[PDB]
Predict the structure of CTB10.
Amino acid sequence: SIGEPNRLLCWSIYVTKKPDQSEEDHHNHVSKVNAPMMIPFLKKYGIVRYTVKHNDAYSKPKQAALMAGQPEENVLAYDTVFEMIVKDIESIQTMQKDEEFLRTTIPDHFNFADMTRSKGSLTWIEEFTF
Amino acid sequence: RLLCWSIYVTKKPDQSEEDHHNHVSKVNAPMMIPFLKKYGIVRYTVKHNDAYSKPKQAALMAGQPEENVLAYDTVFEMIVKDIESIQTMQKDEEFLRTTIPDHFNFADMTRSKGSLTWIEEFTF
């Protein structure tokens, strides 16, 4: 019954925006509509931290200057990345079975995500703050 | 707006998972911390997609096509207030002297990627 201790986990979702949609629209929906919607469920299931990472018109010129010289192929091209730190997987498995979470959030994904081109990652992490 | 400098690495093709992640945590990471501190770096997060996380990833993503899995072995995240903090570090000759050759010990540098993003963050 003794087991390897639980390490901090990061659950990350990589979102490509809908083809027709504009960057403004995608990013507005995510920060203004989809984020307030998610906050409640994350609190409830004991998510440590929630980070939304934007690669939009504000970051891309900073990105082009920092990575000048690199081929476009060496850039990760997702419009948004959502990241949730949790202490254990069961937090997120239970939230994925939440009928309320699902009927709320799942149809909203069709307003900003191309699901044929989105990805997920569940990692254990080492974090250092300075 | 805080920024996130993210590097996505696939292990060297003739290297085991065990060795990749051992190298990253024990060799690369203590090499990097001094430089990250010294420049303006706020937070450094190493994410590991190895045999500890993969069974948890599979349980959680059960049913989904394998193509939906992000395939990188390690992901390195640097929070900074400006790109200038990363640039200054990437022109430190002792940083370059030591960290570049170390990349050849863990990363397949044909299949690595970077991203720079601005972040929204809510702590609970």
In short: Chain B touches chain A through 50 residues (CB under 8 Å). Residues 3-118 of chain B form a domain with the Alpha-Beta Plaits fold (CATH 3.30.70.100). The helical segments of chain B are 17-38, 54-61, 84-89, 93-103.
